[model samples]
Target: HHRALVLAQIRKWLDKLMFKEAFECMRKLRINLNLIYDHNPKVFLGNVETFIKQIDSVNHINLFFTELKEEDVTKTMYPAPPDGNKIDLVCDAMRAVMESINPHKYCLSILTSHVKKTTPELEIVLQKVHELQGNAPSDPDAVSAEEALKYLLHLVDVNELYDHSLGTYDFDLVLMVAEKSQKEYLPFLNTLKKMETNYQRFTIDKYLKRYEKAIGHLSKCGPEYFPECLNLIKDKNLYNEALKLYSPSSQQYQDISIAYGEHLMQEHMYEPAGLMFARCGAHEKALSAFLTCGNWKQALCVAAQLNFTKDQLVGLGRTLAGKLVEQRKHIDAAMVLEECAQDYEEAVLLLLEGAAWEEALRLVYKYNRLDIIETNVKPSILEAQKNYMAFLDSQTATFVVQNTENLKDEVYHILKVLFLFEFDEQGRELQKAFEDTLQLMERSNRRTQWKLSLL
Candidate 1:
């Protein structure tokens, strides 16, 4: 009742190496062919090629076409052309046949010749070639798929080539190609501008070599685009333009500020870079930059701003104090030890080394370091007193020939202090020393005045 049993006779004829008989059996059976090729594609394709080759004439090739659908015949033969012989055979046979089969759909040979046509109409040939590009070229000497695609792209419309260049993700080349084709170019670029995200527009303008326009576009974009824009700024190493757009309080500002700070440091502009680092909350870099340029004050300020543990604060203070003392800034070092480290002992030691006896006493008293006063301050003060007495005695001898202006000023200030400590024994001794020093200073002045009169 059913026609399914009739397929066995075609297989039997195929097994007997009777391909034409098998083809005739298939034609008389009128069985559905989609299943036959789908079920045994290799066998079916080989047998069909055998049946076509066995016929050996255009008239019989036309007869073979009558047995299958037009689309089915093309689907069979499109990828079947291996060598030039079979390729020419299919082309020779299908040339006499009607144009019902889409050789463009299944055959690269047709597209190879179609690509040789004039420029404008070659656009559709690429569209058709791209749609059904399965099998490769027959001749090894022929252009590769990529080379042919590149050539066909060169012949397509300006916007089509532009779009293809853009799809390659090389906007630099895209802009170069677009600049070569003035037609539809502005409109082509306008289409990119019409996209939802300005980020793409930013990229387009950046690759177009309009750096200012690129940053301007990104400057108006939202925070969602910041990471990429910042990356661009980083790679471009242009921070000033981007820095102007964001407020200093923003995360984006901090991000670019750190980047810009690093740039400034790279340029050896350490002071401003230190400030920039502090503004960006990179306190450690701020401190390091400050120290790089020997800016202890700014470093101390940045250190104060940090949430440092006591040990870290003390360590930083000790290190910075050493730097200050190296530059003979011992008073400033004392201040850091006192204010930052809260180490009154080291502060007083630094103060005394700087000859700031009064400030040292004030610091020792301020932090209730009474234990240090007798042990350290007493010996330091007595030693300083001995040094002062020796200095006054030497000045008393030298006042007759020396420039007495500076010496006179020092003696007057010391005399004022002597009046305050009038009752103390050490003060009395120093007063006698100063009084004798004043006697020599007066004589020196008189001798200078007399010499001036003679001159």
Candidate 2:
């Protein structure tokens, strides 16, 4: 009877803690109860009844009784074989509590904390809870998909809340969210279709790649999902346009047209595919399709494939160089300028404008044509030299005016330049230039010195 009273007090205290702690205490008590009950169930039941009778309220007694029956607590304590009905009741009670809260919010920390105080296998319960919520993004209201994605990223576990209301949602947003959420939920493409506005359309290859990757993961979902994937690969309008060649009077060309459309959609070789389609009597389709994907190089290649003229090739090279510069492939752009300089004089000018200086110099040297550099480079260098000398003169004037004591240092620098350059003819010329400039500086300094002396 004293042991029963002590166990009842412990159960009352355990109930006040969180469910995880309560369960843990119940687990320990069950082990002791098993040993005691093995001797006699009748004596154990009578002891529990006397303990419950001591409770002041029916609610406290009922709470203790319910907790005692929990699987983690009481079932293993009993010596008798468990009834099937009792097992069902225990499973149902456990399921009811689990279903009451969000599975992700289960008290894993509390369980682990108790494990340190008790046994290690309590960790298995925590692991099971984590497995159930794996990669599931929370469904909180977010202003944009990017905002929603903030909640979804488990990898970083960012703390900022997302606002989901601001922008039109699209497949890119869905893809981004899926990526952030670790691809747990497959966002429907229909959500993107509804969000499309006239200003923005999702037709790029990047969008296609994302859809292809996502749909491949979701292949087991159902047949209805495949149509969206198919439409993304080849739209219905493109498929219907291909069917126009079909006639009941002629052999079915439906397969051929479908194959051609699919081929064009999948083919990475833009020029050959365009030429092939043109040769197959699909001139307008081939031309339009090719031009849609045509970069300057591909366009030039197509023109050359038809034997374009030398003048056309020159123009094409210029266009290609401009495009390359626009793409910021400056070295490749320089090569184009080198090629173009073979025919046209203006190509050399373009090379310099494009800052392809080395290539420009190469063309000039190759043709022994120093006229371009001598005409352009020399004058620019001379103008820069004159401006630099004027800046030096102004700075020297200011220094001499500001520091009468440092006027000796200015004189020494001028004399040093003349001494160092006294041997070479150009050096001698530069020394003469410096001497002439220094005379102006000296004359200005003398007037200032005389005024200061008078003062």
Candidate 3:
């Protein structure tokens, strides 16, 4: 009865600082532990970790083993000094945790020395350390997959056997470590080739390079494994494979985005290359990528934010216009040429074809074609010029002033109706002059009637 009460209330006593009552209650539960260990013991085998903190203090960790030896269960769990035939599981557990988390070199070295001579073997301890790792990033207290692989490899004494003949060995465990661990990948194509194992060797024997074909198949499974594998392929200069593998969004995919951008740039896939560069905040590189693809609008989008000179902007615009012209996208090409370079021959020709008379007229006058103004030029402008007011709307008069290389008569007739055109007191001005001139026979039939009577 006392034992049941104690076990039920033990956690309450611990929380409440009722240490004396907690110990007394624990004493009631001694019957079961006595029968198991066949003696009085301060800790149980399975519950051994529960009591190690009881005696540990902030500045007195050296007393750790001392406190453990005094526990009723610690004597059995502790490995025998040098003479034991088998390593104790509890001792290995302590050593594994210490080696993974300990900050002091002396503490780690001392623990390492103790674990080395045991007959159950250091390999078992190291392997258990690997098993304790989770799919989490590195920290001082937990073993990351990266650390475990190095530890595993160190025990086998092969620091880099994976490099040569990587496909010959099974690296499934190491693959998990490489992908999930966020470590640097140095030349891992051979390992990537092994994962790309969908090709049946017997079926593809007739191909050019049978094994290389076999290495073409890649895994869509394990997103955890994809990024490192993509980087590995890229470093090996295997671009097609890198494109086939990289897919990105969240934080872990940052390196994948960078490698993917480089892959795009290498293949002359510049539009998406620029977008990828932008995605990674490589703004200047994004601008360069857009320019490389002759993507002017996209380049403009990037350049708009940059402190570009008037010359650089014009140069970029010209490059885009040239590419557009090659595609015969003349309307867009003309605008780019006009806006950036201000040369109107090509743009005006496109405007003439489309009958975009107003927009073209402004550019045409600014760039002189006075020689052709009479025949080729005058006819089109006059035909498209619906009325004299059409000249007032677009800066035709302003543009005409810019064409100074032309003779005075050519500039005059080129713009038939011009502005800064003074008011006529005899007529009225603009509408007044033109309006009164039409009524030379004023008041309809009244003026033509010999000042009224002739009608």
State which candidate has the highest TM-score: 1
| Model 2 clashing residue pairs (backbone) | 142-163, 142-164, 143-163, 143-164, 143-165, 144-164
Deviation (Å) of 17 in candidate 1: 99
Give the alpha carbon lDDT tens digit for every residue of 80-170 in model 1: 2232233233333343222234342323334433333222234444454444334546555344445445544444565566554544334
How far out, in Å, is residue 172 in model 2? 36
Better of 1 and 2 by TM-score: 1
lDDT of 3 by residue, 1-455 (tens): 75445445654554444444554444454422212121222233333334323322322222232223213341453111222222244344444544554433224222333434444244334444334443444446554535545544433334332331133223454455445433455345354445434432212221223332323433333455555445445665554444444445554356656776887898888889899888677779898897666577777778777867888877877887877777666677788878777756767776654455556566756867644445454455545333434443333434312322232233233233222222122112333422333343223222221111111
TM-score of decoy 2 = 0.28
| Model 3: residue 305 alpha-carbon error in angstroms | 2.4
lDDT of 2 by residue, 351-453 (tens): 5554444455566667777876668644433343355356556765555134423443433333332233232343344345544555654442343221111
Candidate ranking under TM-score, highest first, comes to 1, 3, 2
Per-residue lDDT value at 278 in model 1: 87
Cα-based TM-score, every candidate: 0.37, 0.28, 0.30
Clashing pairs in 1: none
The lDDT values for all models are 0.60, 0.41, 0.47
> Runs in model 1 with CA error above 4 Å?
1-213, 220-232, 235-237, 247-251, 287-306, 364-455
